[PDB]
């Protein structure tokens, strides 16, 4: 499953988290009123989620494998030890995110999200 924190219903203003895998009918209805959520909006929010996470990845802290010390400088390739620095936000976990998002897009006709995903994949052979 995949939930979007507090999506707002443009028809009645009812706010609630939305589970995209568990709350389909291919559409998403508001819980309070039964107005369908604007797929267009969902698509864009998903895209922003990719951005926010792509940003988190780019600015992520780096940890030493020997000591659990967070890197505090920019150039060192190794630690005060001789330990190696490791990602605190993993590539693998990001790809999985893309797999989920790629699925939702394939199933809900979100060509834009497919495009961004595809680019995001093309630039990572």
Partner 1 sequence: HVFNIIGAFDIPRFVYNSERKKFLPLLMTNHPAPNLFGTPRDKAEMFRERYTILHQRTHRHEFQLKTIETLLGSTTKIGDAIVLGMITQLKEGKFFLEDPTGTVQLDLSKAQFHSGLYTEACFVLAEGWFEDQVFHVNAFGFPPTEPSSTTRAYYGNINFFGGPSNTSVKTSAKLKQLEEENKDAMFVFLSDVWLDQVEVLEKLRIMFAGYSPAPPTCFILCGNFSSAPYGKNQVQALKDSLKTLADIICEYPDIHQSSRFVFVPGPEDPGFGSILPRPPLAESITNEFRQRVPFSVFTTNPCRIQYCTQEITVFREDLVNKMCRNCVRFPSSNLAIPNHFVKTILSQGHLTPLPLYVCPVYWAYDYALRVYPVPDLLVIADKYDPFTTTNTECLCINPGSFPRSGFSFKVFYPSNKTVEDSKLQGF
Pairing assessment for the beta strands 85-87 and 62-64 based on DSSP bridges? antiparallel
> Is 10 near Zn ion (CB under 5 A)?
no
> Is 82 near partner 1 (CB under 8 A)?
no
Choose the stretch contacting partner 1; rule: CB under 8 A; options: 13-21, 22-30, 72-80, 100-108: 72-80
Taking the complex as a whole, the smallest distance from the CB of residue 112 to Zn ion amounts, in Å, to 24
Q: Out of 54, 67, 93, 95, name the contact with Zn ion by CB under 5 A.
A: 67
User: 12 labelled as ligand-binding?
Assistant: yes
Q: Are 94 and 53 in contact (CB under 8 A)?
A: yes
Three-class SS state of 6: strand
User: 15 labelled as ligand-binding?
Assistant: no
> Is 115 near partner 1 (CB under 8 A)?
yes
User: 81 labelled as ligand-binding?
Assistant: yes
Cα of first residue to Cα of last residue in the chain, in angstroms, is 27
Three-class SS state of 77: coil
Among Zn ion, partner 1, none, residue 30 binds (CB under 5-8 Å by kind): Zn ion
User: 21 labelled as ligand-binding?
Assistant: no
Cα-based distances in Å from 121 to 34, 63, 117: 36, 26, 6
90: left (phi over 0), alpha (psi -120 to 50) or beta: beta
Could you tell me which residues are annotated as the binding site?
9, 12, 30, 33, 64, 67, 79, 81
Q: Known binding site for Zn(2+): residues?
A: 9, 12, 30, 33
């Amino acid at each position: 499953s995949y939930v979007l924190p507090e999506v707002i219903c443009r028809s009645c203003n009812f706010c609630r988290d939305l589970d995209l895998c568990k709350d389909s009918s291919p559409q998403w209805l508001c819980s309070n009123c039964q107005a369908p959520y604007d797929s267009s909006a969902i698509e864009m929010t998903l895209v922003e989620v990719l951005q926010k996470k792509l940003m988190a990845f780019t600015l992520q802290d780096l940890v030493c494998l020997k000591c659990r010390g967070v890197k505090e400088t920019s150039m060192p390739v190794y630690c005060s030890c001789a330990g190696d620095f490791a990602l605190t936000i993993h590539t693998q976990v990001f790809m999985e995110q893309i797999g989920i998002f790629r699925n939702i897009a394939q199933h809900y006709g979100m060509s834009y999200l497919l495009e961004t995903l595809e680019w995001l994949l093309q630039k990572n052979p």
